[PDB]
Amino acid sequence: NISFIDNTKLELQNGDEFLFIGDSLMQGVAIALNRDLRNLNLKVTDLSKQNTGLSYKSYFDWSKATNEAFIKNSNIKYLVVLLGANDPWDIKKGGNYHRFGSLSWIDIYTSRVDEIIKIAKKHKAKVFWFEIPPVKKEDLNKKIQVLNKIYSDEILKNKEIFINTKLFFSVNDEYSAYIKDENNRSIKVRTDDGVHFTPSGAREMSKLLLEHIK
Ligand SMILES: [Cl-]
User: Fold this and answer.
1) Residue 171 domain flag
2) 24 alpha carbon – ligand 1 mean position (Å)
3) Does 4 map to a domain?
4) Which sequence ranges are marked TM in the entry (predicted)?
5) Are 14 and 163 in contact (CB under 8 A)?
6) Does a structural domain hold residue 12?
7) Ligand 1 center–CA 134 separation, angstroms
8) Ligand 1 centroid from CA 14, angstroms
C-alpha cells in the first residue's frame, strides 16, 4: 500500500539549479513548481515532454536527454522526476517480449529507473522523484502502483528522495477528483480525464516537493 513515508528535507545551496524531466504530468506540475521555485530565487530548466516515458525509450530516451542537460549546465544539482503514466504496457525488444509486471519486465523497467538516478549521482545531483498519484481508471491505477513500487524501491536503494502523493490525492483510500484545501474546503485537483491536474492540483503537487526542502 505504502512502502515508506519519506521525511527527508534537503538544505539548498547557493547557485544550485533545478532540472525537471518527465511526461505531461510533470508538464502540469512544472507550471506550479516553477512559480514556487522562482519565488525562492531558484533557476529551473524544464525539459518535461508530452508522450514520453521510460518504456518508450526507443522513441525518446530520458537517460540521454538527462545526461546531456547536465553536460550543458554544471550548476544543475537537483533533478525532479514525474513520469510513468504512459509506461505500464508490454515491451517488445527485437524478438524478445516482456509482459507488463513480469519478472523480466520489472528487471528492464527497474534498470531504466536506475539509469536516471545514476546519471544524476554521476553529476553530483540529488533526485526528487514523485509518486504517481492515483488515477480514475481502475485497471490503469493498479498498474501505476507497480510503477510506484519500483520508483520507491530504487529511490530508497540510492538514498534519494521519494515524494509521497498517494494519501494526499486519495479520499478514503481511493481516487478522487476533489480534495480538501488548506481551509478544509473542497477543491477540484484532477482534470476530467482522471489523470492530469487542474492548476490547484498542480500547486498541491508542488507543495509536496517544497515540503522536502528547507
Ligand atoms: Cl504524456
Assistant:
1) yes
2) 4
3) no
4) none
5) no
6) no
7) 16
8) 32
Domain-embedded: residue 75: yes
Query: Which amino acid belongs to residue 135?
Result: V
How far apart are alpha carbons 6 and 15 in whole angstroms? 26
Calculate how far, in angstroms, residue 35's C-alpha sits from the geometric centre of ligand 1: 21
Evaluate whether 45 touches 95 at the Cβ level (below 8 Å).
no
Q: What approach was used to elucidate this structure? A: X-ray
Among candidate residues 151, 185, 213, 181, the one with its CA nearest the CA of residue 25: 151
Q: What is the CATH number of the domain that holds 82?
A: 3.40.50.1110
Question: Ligand 1 centroid to 109 CA: how many Å?
Answer: 18
d(CA 56, CA 23): 11
Single-letter residue type at 193? D
Q: How far does the centroid of ligand 1 lie from the alpha carbon of residue 59, in Å?
A: 13
How many structural domains does the chain have?
1
Cell of 54: 521510460
The number of beta carbons lying within 10 Å of the beta carbon of residue 102 is 13
Which grid coordinates are listed for 198?
A: 487542474
Q: What are the grid coordinates assigned to 63, written together?
A: 537517460
3-state secondary structure of 15: coil
Q: Which of 212, 202, 214 is nearest to 33 (CA)?
A: 202
Dist. CA 25–CA 138, nearest whole Å? 18
- What's the domain range around 97? 17-210
